[PDB]
Design an enzyme around this catalytic site. Structure first.
Site, short mmCIF file in Angstrom:
data_model
loop_
_atom_site.label_atom_id
_atom_site.label_comp_id
_atom_site.label_asym_id
_atom_site.label_seq_id
_atom_site.Cartn_x
_atom_site.Cartn_y
_atom_site.Cartn_z
N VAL A 189 23.28 7.16 -10.69
CA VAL A 189 23.57 8.54 -11.03
C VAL A 189 24.99 8.62 -11.55
O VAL A 189 25.93 8.17 -10.88
CB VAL A 189 23.38 9.49 -9.83
CG1 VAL A 189 23.68 10.95 -10.23
CG2 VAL A 189 21.96 9.37 -9.28
N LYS A 245 24.67 1.79 -11.58
CA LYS A 245 25.19 3.12 -11.26
C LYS A 245 24.03 4.08 -11.45
O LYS A 245 23.80 4.58 -12.56
CB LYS A 245 26.39 3.49 -12.14
CG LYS A 245 26.81 4.97 -12.02
CD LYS A 245 28.28 5.08 -11.74
CE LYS A 245 28.67 6.50 -11.36
NZ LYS A 245 29.84 6.45 -10.42
O1 LIG Z 1 31.71 14.87 -1.24
C1 LIG Z 1 31.62 15.94 -1.90
O2 LIG Z 1 32.34 16.93 -1.63
C2 LIG Z 1 30.62 16.04 -3.05
C3 LIG Z 1 30.96 15.07 -4.17
C4 LIG Z 1 32.31 15.14 -4.87
C5 LIG Z 1 32.65 14.16 -5.99
C6 LIG Z 1 31.62 13.11 -6.41
C7 LIG Z 1 31.87 12.07 -7.50
C8 LIG Z 1 32.16 12.51 -8.98
C9 LIG Z 1 32.14 13.86 -9.22
C10 LIG Z 1 33.01 14.01 -10.63
C11 LIG Z 1 34.00 13.05 -10.60
C12 LIG Z 1 33.65 12.08 -9.38
C13 LIG Z 1 33.72 10.71 -9.77
C14 LIG Z 1 33.74 9.78 -8.54
O3 LIG Z 1 34.49 10.04 -7.56
O4 LIG Z 1 32.99 8.77 -8.51
C15 LIG Z 1 30.28 13.03 -5.69
C16 LIG Z 1 29.95 14.01 -4.57
#
Ligand SMILES: O=C(O)Cc1ccc(C[C@H]2CCC[C@@H]2CC(=O)O)cc1
Ligand SMILES: O=C(O)Cc1ccc(C[C@@H]2CCC[C@H]2CC(=O)O)cc1
Lengths: 226, 227
Positions: free
Chosen positions: A40, A38
């Site tokens: 990031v 993973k």
């Molecule tokens: O696409 C977009 O709008 C930007 C965007 C949106 C959300 C994420 C992932 C992370 C963010 C926090 C919880 C999530 C955990 C997960 O889903 O792996 C990455 C890019």
């Protein structure tokens, strides 16, 4: 080397991490050596740690990460807020290549959906999968709208010759319901549905999760992965 | 003919209908003749009628439907549940072609997202847009996840050379949190953001809706849609 699979999803919060753990667990129970990369992680302020989820759910120990950002946002937005750049494309690709070895199933988790920026500048899990010649497992929901999002993600994969290893429904409701039941049949006509994890599986202890995982996937397909 | 715009979205329930009404209202206020058509409508059994809502909000009278199905599901599943068939590709094209005329903006509202099947076999609003030489206006949310869904949708449009007329944020929160604000700025870097409808727009009465609509879009972009 061995088998590199990227584990993506139609979106955010669709069950990518629990599926990665489920496949990891089922593959370990097949005697396959499993690593998860993973590169990031965001959301560390509130406790997010998908590598530790796989570690505890599946028992994987080869858990490789490069960067952790406190804000529960997209990697680009999280890194912008922290005032520190995302990792470089070379770091991600080389880390995965260094992880990959004969006999090993290496799963790669990005963040959110397929076209999310993971490294500078605008490098995605799709670019990374091309670079490491990985196929893509696509995690989907059972809910209204999953068909459009799945078809969109599979087009984007094929538009870069990233093979689709199949779909996993990240959370399968009990009892299904008309939309869920219809969607599961429609999804199967789009691609191979490799598993549908019971709703609530993320809360299982390691032994129960291993039992669920072994039952959720087809042994021959798992064992055929490496 | 005139200008045919398909109005699509990154998914279901993102604001396609209210955006269709808002652009129709804005175009009508600039003196442009507006027709709105809905090739496939599902959920009639719970009162879903996007043409009727567009008429309610924007005052559009030229409203054309074709296929209607009771269950609030995808067209293929809703047609199969009712014992009915999806329309054919040429029926949707005829529906739209009959509306097209010079000086008229014809809006074609999809069902769900862009790759939803509207006609057998696997015919989508993207195919329709190719068939009638229409650009696609993409309705998006400001929520976590919108950037991936927007980029996926725009990539699918380009794959068949369907011009993207721009994005519309279907609901814009006031005030915006960090994610909403970060997303709006990122969305504007992937394509032109034609408007960002204020949250609660679907509830405005006719006068307020018309005022909201006139403010939401750039008058020069709207007026340039059709000569
Ligand atoms: O696409 C977009 O709008 C930007 C965007 C949106 C959300 C994420 C992932 C992370 C963010 C926090 C919880 C999530 C955990 C997960 O889903 O792996 C990455 C890019
Ligand atoms: O993408 C899929 O899963 C297939 C798919 C899901 C949903 C819809 C339209 C929904 C259904 C009832 C209400 C309507 C709202 C809307 O227009 O978005 C079409 C296709």
């Amino acid at each position: 080397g061995g088998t590199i699979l990227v584990v993506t999803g139609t979106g955010t919060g669709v069950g990518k991490t629990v599926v990665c753990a489920a496949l990891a667990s089922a593959a370990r129970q097949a005697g396959i050596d499993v690593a998860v990369c993973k590169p990031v992680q965001t959301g560390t302020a509130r406790g997010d740690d998908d590598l530790a989820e796989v570690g505890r759910l599946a028992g994987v120990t080869q858990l490789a990460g490069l960067a952790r950002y406190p804000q529960p946002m997209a990697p680009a937005a999280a890194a912008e807020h922290a005032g520190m750049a995302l990792p470089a494309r070379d770091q991600i690709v080389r880390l995965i290549a260094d992880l990959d070895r004969p006999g090993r199933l290496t799963l790669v988790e990005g963040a959110g959906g397929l076209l999310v920026e993971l490294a500078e500048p605008g490098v995605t899990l799709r670019d990374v999968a091309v670079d490491v010649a990985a196929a893509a497992l696509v995690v989907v929901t059972a809910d209204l709208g999953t068909l459009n999002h799945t078809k969109l993600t599979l087009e984007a994969l094929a538009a870069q010759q990233v093979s689709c290893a199949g779909l996993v429904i990240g959370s399968w409701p009990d009892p299904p319901g008309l939309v869920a039941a219809s969607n599961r049949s429609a999804l199967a006509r789009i691609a191979m549905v490799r598993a549908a994890l019971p709703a609530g599986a993320a809360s299982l202890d390691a032994g129960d999760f291993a039992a669920m995982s072994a039952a959720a996937f087809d042994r021959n397909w798992v064992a055929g992965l490496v």
